């Protein structure tokens, strides 16, 4: 699946085409939660080393948090790319095929019949 799409230019992380997609804002809750995830990372590190946590976490905690914001940021970007090309593929294949997917008119309730067993 989708390897025919991206096997044309292999191992492109995200292509020169992706830059037309709006990048995730800073404060995007996802990568912020990733920052928290670096926070609990560093906390568990300071639990591993018997030191009391909240100590040494001046440089460490910041290193963790910033690292995950970095990596997680790029990951989110390429993600939004992936769903972009997915939705595009859907709509193109929709339009190019009238027969496969029929457009039916949805008739209003005026013509409807049901059973609807009442309670009693």
């Amino acid at each position: 699946m989708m390897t025919g799409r991206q096997a044309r230019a292999p191992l492109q992380f995200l292509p020169d085409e992706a830059r037309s997609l709006p990048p995730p804002k800073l404060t995007d809750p996802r990568l912020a939660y990733i920052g928290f995830l670096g926070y609990c990372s560093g906390l568990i590190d300071n639990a591993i080393r018997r030191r009391p946590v909240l100590s040494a976490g001046l440089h460490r905690q910041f290193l963790y948090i910033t690292s995950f914001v970095f990596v997680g940021y790029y990951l989110l970007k390429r993600q939004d790319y992936m769903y972009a090309v997915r939705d595009h593929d859907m709509f193109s294949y929709i339009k190019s095929h009238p027969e496969d997917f029929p457009e039916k008119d949805k008739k209003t309730y005026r013509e409807v019949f049901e059973e609807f067993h009442p309670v009693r």
């Binding site: 909240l54 049901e114 059973e115 609807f116 067993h117 309670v119």
Partner: protein
């Protein structure tokens, strides 16, 4: 809703970073300050259930249950102290942290729009409770009654996910709003059989129906008082709640499929109501009581009259405060003499002459006393079930007589008839005990004035 999600999440580091001896003060304080805005949550009006955000919303029922939760934390935590009041700080902050996180997943669950978010947050609610009661439960042999307890849940509680995802890809959205308006009738056959049975029994494991009721007693005798007020004031109402919502579909099916379960709950109401009469060891009595009222709830859910819901939800809340409190009485009696066995000590009309009023008052509120919300809910439920079957009132009102008998038997032989005089320990009352009792009853008696808050979505 997010304005209620942050403040508790911020209430976590409030716990973690703090000076020793102030943790209870800080947590209690800010937690009640949460309860204020929990009371802010009522805008609910007219017809459309308010929707805060596209992820999660609130109709009525979610609002009373939620208010009850956010109200219940500060009282719970308030109650849990002096169960220990000696330990390393890490035990305290760990425990309060766990109660917090538990509340968070509860709010997630009640507010959750979409049933898969409801389910993930569902078991995510079950874990913290388990950690609470198992890690220190006073552990009589421990029974291993937390863990394979979680197996009592998941054993048949997992496949409801299967059935859900089926509903997902067939109809698209699992948003509850759009699952409404798109719900389409499902005929009676063997596939709809295994499905309806899947969802139904999946939730019916939580509020114990008489078949499965062995679930509660052990888990609830092993629970520390905080885990008890968690458990039987809330964690059953999750099952009954989700039941309320997922019964939206299954429209004709629930008749032919309902009937056996209804039978089992009408008989088991009487059975459980009986067995809870003769037992010793007070902590169990209120448990099987919970089993009884919850059986009555299931009876109310399956028959779909709106009256049935109004009385139902009313019974969820009223039984929540009542059962919760009454547990906390059992505990306040347990710290005095270390027993758990009812018949051991007696008296306490002579001694603790005030604690009488809270025993009496609470027991009466479980006696189905007419203005009490418990009798509002129980009453409407009896009306609905009599509408369904003219005959069933023999069983119902027979539960009235038995529930009267044990509910008023607990009021005695713990509290009356003699002082055993080999005790000479019990220290008179506390201010904290009175605070807990008061914080329970006083709202339960006030709600008996303006109940239209707690009656269900249909009203």
């Amino acid at each position: 809703m997010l304005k209620y999600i942050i403040p508790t999440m911020m209430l976590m580091p409030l716990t973690w970073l703090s000076k020793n001896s102030m943790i209870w003060i800080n947590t209690t304080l800010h937690s009640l300050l949460i309860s204020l805005t929990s009371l802010l949550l009522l805008n609910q009006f007219g017809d459309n259930s308010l929707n805060f955000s596209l992820t999660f919303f609130s109709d009525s029922l979610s609002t009373p249950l939620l208010i009850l939760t956010m109200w219940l934390l500060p009282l719970m935590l308030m109650a849990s102290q002096h169960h220990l009041s000696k330990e390393n700080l890490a035990r305290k902050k760990l425990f309060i942290s766990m109660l917090i996180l538990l509340q968070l997943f509860l709010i997630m669950t009640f507010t959750a729009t979409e049933l898969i978010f409801f389910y993930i947050m569902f078991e995510a609610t079950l874990v913290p409770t388990l950690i609470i009661i198992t890690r220190w439960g006073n552990q009589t042999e421990r029974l291993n009654a937390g863990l394979y307890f979680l197996f009592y849940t998941l054993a048949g509680s997992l496949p409801l996910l299967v059935a859900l995802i089926y509903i997902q890809n067939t109809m698209g959205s699992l948003n509850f709003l759009i699952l409404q308006y798109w719900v389409q009738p499902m005929p009676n056959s063997w596939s709809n059989t295994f499905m309806w049975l899947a969802c139904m029994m999946a939730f019916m494991v939580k509020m114990p129906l008489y078949g499965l009721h062995l679930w509660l007693p052990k888990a609830h005798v092993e629970a520390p008082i905080a885990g008890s007020m968690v458990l039987a004031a809330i964690l059953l109402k999750l099952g009954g709640y989700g039941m309320m919502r997922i019964t939206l579909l299954l429209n004709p099916i629930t008749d032919f499929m309902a009937y056996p379960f209804i039978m089992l709950s009408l008989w088991g109401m009487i059975m459980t109501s009986s067995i809870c009469l003769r037992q010793t060891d007070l902590k169990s009595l209120i448990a099987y009581s919970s089993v009884s009222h919850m059986a009555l709830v299931i009876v109310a859910i399956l028959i779909q009259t709106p009256w049935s819901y109004m009385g139902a939800t009313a019974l969820m809340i009223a039984h929540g405060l009542t059962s919760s409190m009454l547990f906390c009485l059992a505990n306040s009696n347990y710290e005095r003499v270390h027993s758990r066995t009812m018949i051991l000590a007696r008296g306490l009309q002579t001694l603790l002459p005030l604690m009488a009023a809270w025993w009496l008052l609470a027991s009466l509120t479980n006696l189905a006393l007419p203005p009490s919300i418990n009798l509002i809910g129980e009453l409407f439920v009896v009306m609905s079930t009599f509408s369904w079957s003219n005959i069933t009132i023999i069983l119902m009102g027979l539960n009235m007589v038995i529930t009267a008998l044990y509910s008023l038997y607990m009021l005695i032989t713990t509290q009356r008839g003699k002082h055993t005089h080999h005790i000479n320990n019990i220290l008179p009352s506390f201010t904290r005990e009175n605070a807990l009792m008061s914080l329970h009853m006083l709202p339960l008696l006030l709600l008996s004035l303006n109940p239209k808050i707690i009656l269900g979505p249909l009203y």
